[PDB]
Structure formats: structure tokens, C-alpha cells
Structure 1
Amino acid sequence: DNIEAVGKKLHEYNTQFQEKSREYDRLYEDYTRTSQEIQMKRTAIEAFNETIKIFEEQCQTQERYSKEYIEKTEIQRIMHNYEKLKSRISEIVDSRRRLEEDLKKQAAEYREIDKRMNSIKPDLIQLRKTRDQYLMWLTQKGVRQKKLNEWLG
């Protein structure tokens, strides 16, 4: 209630605000970074869809182009070549599946970052206001700008 006592509390409350701000700022970096990574993942998954579409048009062609042809030992080479094709698709399916699993895991991280932000906001906003209420109180009491400066930070 004395000026030095309120000014001390203004120092503490300012330090708590600047640090709380620093925390939120770090989380907001993670929020943004995670948002860029997930967009990247969702479009790399599109890239997996589009590749696999290309491999299944190939399979379609292999059947239509082979059936009409194959009435005329070449058979064994064609069919094994097709089996080798079909085999590669399964690698590309498996790899797509792995990414989907990362994107699911990173979606849960995004989810959690945003939750951790939303429980800091009340503290952060309450500390801004308190800091400001002590500032105005002292400005009213006549406390000189030099003294207010040295309490802040």
C-alpha cells in the first residue's frame, strides 16, 4: 500500500508477464511450424495418391494391352514383369501408410500445442491487466517516470 511496496509488486508482476509472454511466443512458434509441416504432409499424401493412381493406370494398361496381345515363353516375361510392377506398388502403399501415421501423430501434437496455448492466455491476460493496474495506480500517486522505468524489467 506504500509506494515502494506497490512498486516492488509492479516489478515482480512485470517479470512474470514478460516470462509468460516468452513462453506463449515459444508455443506460438511451434503452433505455426506444426501448421506448415502438416500442410506439407497432407500434400505429400496427395503426392502419394497421385503416384499410386499412375501405377494403377499402368496396371489397367498391362491387362488390356496384354490380353489382346498374348494369344501370339514371352508370356512368362510379361507376367513376371507385371508381378514386379504390382510388387513395387505395395512398397509405395506401405510408405504412404507410414506418412498417414506421422500426420495423425503430428495432428495430436498440433491439438496439444493449441490446448497448452489456451490455458496460458488467461494467465497472460490477467498479468497484463494487473501490471497495468499497478502502473496506473503509481502514475496517479505522482510517481516519477524514472522510478517506473527501473521497476519495469
Structure 2
Amino acid sequence: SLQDAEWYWGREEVNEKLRDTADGTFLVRDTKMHGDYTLTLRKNKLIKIFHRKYSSVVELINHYRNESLAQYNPKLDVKLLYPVQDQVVKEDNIEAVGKKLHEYNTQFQEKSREYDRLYEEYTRTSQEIQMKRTAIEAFNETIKIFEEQCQTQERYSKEYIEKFKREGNEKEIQRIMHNYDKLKSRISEIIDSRRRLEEDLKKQAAEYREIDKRMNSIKPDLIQLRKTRDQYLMWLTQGVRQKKLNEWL
């Protein structure tokens, strides 16, 4: 009973069992010339158990499952609420629990690639998007310089029509208007270049949302697929066979 004790396992692998449990979840651990047992309550708060009384290790913990730890030490207004082999299809097979550990671990490892793929697509897309955004400010700036140019030429060219005029009246002004015509339909091209970027930007940001959307639907399954796979590996280690595991995994 004191060796079994449910929560009594008997540092690093304690954290991974306390990882992602709620506020109040706990367990008890075992240098002996230091202290004896260690209550690891998550809020990870470590509380010593000295033995010289502790009447027993099980005696002290059942009291504080009912009652908080505030009266003992000021800033611990939290109880030992969650004292964490339940499901696992109850398979008392040993071999077939071992096969399921491969099955779920192939599914988990399959799922982690899909998650890793999409986190790259996401960040490439966040890059590709903002590259387009800057390009649009570049186009828009490019266009100002061309819009300024067709303006800049009108000031000087329509001075050089009126003054003189008769001196090559079309011989001059044809080849001034030709340049002006090339200038403005060039602007027409630049603008239609820019417009066409912005249509892609929304089509990119569309895909960007669709990546994130499926990341958030791959995540919750990935957490429980991992969590089920860990209890399937707990259930086994409750024959030792530390070395046999690796072929399944």
C-alpha cells in the first residue's frame, strides 16, 4: 500500500507527468543525506517530507487532499485536488498493448510531420505576403515618379509649343507627343502590374488563413494522440522491458 499508493511513483520524468495538468495536480517522489520524500504539487511546487513521523507517507497526503496548504505556509492557497492505466482498451495482453504503442506512435509521428510542414508553409507565406506588401509600396512609389514625370514634361513641353510654334509646328510636337504617349501607357502598364499583385496578395492571405485554420485542427488531436501514447507506454512499464520498446517506437 505505501509502495503502491497510486500517486507514489518512487525530477526530469516528474515534470513530464506534471506537464499540462491543471492547477492542484500532484505526486510524491523519493541524495538520501538531504531529505526523504518530495511532494511535487503543480500550481511546479516542491515540498519536502522529513522522516526521523513524516505517522506515515500516506497519512500526510490524504489530509491535504481534503484541505488546502495555506495554513501550513502562507502563499499556497491550493489543495492536492488531482492525485494523478485507465482506458488503453483494458488489454491485459502485454504484446497487443505493445503493438498499439507502435500504431499510435506511427500516427503521432505521421501527424508531427504534417504539423511541421504547415508551420513552414505558414512562415514562408508570412514572408511571401510581406514581400508583396513592400513591392506594392515600391510600385506605388515607382508610379509617383512616373506620374510626376508626365506632369514634369507638360510644364516644359507646353512652354516649347507656344514659344515659336511655327518652327517645325508638327515636326517638333509629334515627337514630343510620342514621348508623352509612351510615358502614359507605360504608367498604364505599371498600374496594371500593381493591381495584379494585390489580387495575388488576397489569394495568398486566403491560403495563409487556410494553413493556420488546419494547424489549429491538427494541434488538439496531436496533444491527445501524444497523451494516449504516453499512458500506453506507462501501462507497459508497470514487465520492465526498457530495451524491447524501441522496435515498436
**1:45 aligns to what?**
136
Q: What are structure 2's unaligned runs of at least 5 residues? A: 1-91, 162-168
Whole-angstrom CA distance in 1 between matches of 2:106 and 2:175: 75
Whole-angstrom CA distance in 1 between matches of 2:131 and 2:157: 39
Identity of counterpart residues, as a percentage?
Answer: 96
Structure 1 residue 73: Cα displacement: 4.2
Bigger relative contact order (CA 8 A; separation at least 6): 1
Residues 25-82 of structure 1: per-residue CA shift (max 9 Å, x gap): 1222221222221122112212211110110111221122233443994233323321
User: SS at the partner of 1:73?
Assistant: coil
Whole-angstrom CA distance in 2 between matches of 1:18 and 1:62: 65
Q: 1:88 to 1:72 in 2, by over 3 A?
A: closer
Structure 1 residue 84: Cα displacement: 1.8
User: SS at the partner of 1:117?
Assistant: helix
User: SS at the partner of 1:145?
Assistant: coil
Q: 1:72 to 1:13 in 2, by over 3 A?
A: closer
The size of the alignment, in residue pairs, is 151
User: SS at the partner of 1:69?
Assistant: helix
The TM-score normalised by the length of structure 2 is 0.56
The structure with the largest alpha-carbon Rg is 2
Q: What are structure 1's unaligned runs of at least 5 residues? A: none
RMSD across aligned positions (CA): 2.1
More helix by share: 1
Whole-angstrom CA distance in 2 between matches of 1:68 and 1:83: 18
Work out whether 1:66 is the aligned partner of 2:157: yes
**Comparing 5-14 with 49-58, which one deviates more in the overlay?**
5-14
Residues 4-26 of structure 1: per-residue CA shift (max 9 Å, x gap): 22212111111110111111112
More strand by share: 2
Whole-angstrom CA distance in 2 between matches of 1:72 and 1:65: 17
Residues 64-111 of structure 1: per-residue CA shift (max 9 Å, x gap): 223344399423332332122111100111111111111111111111
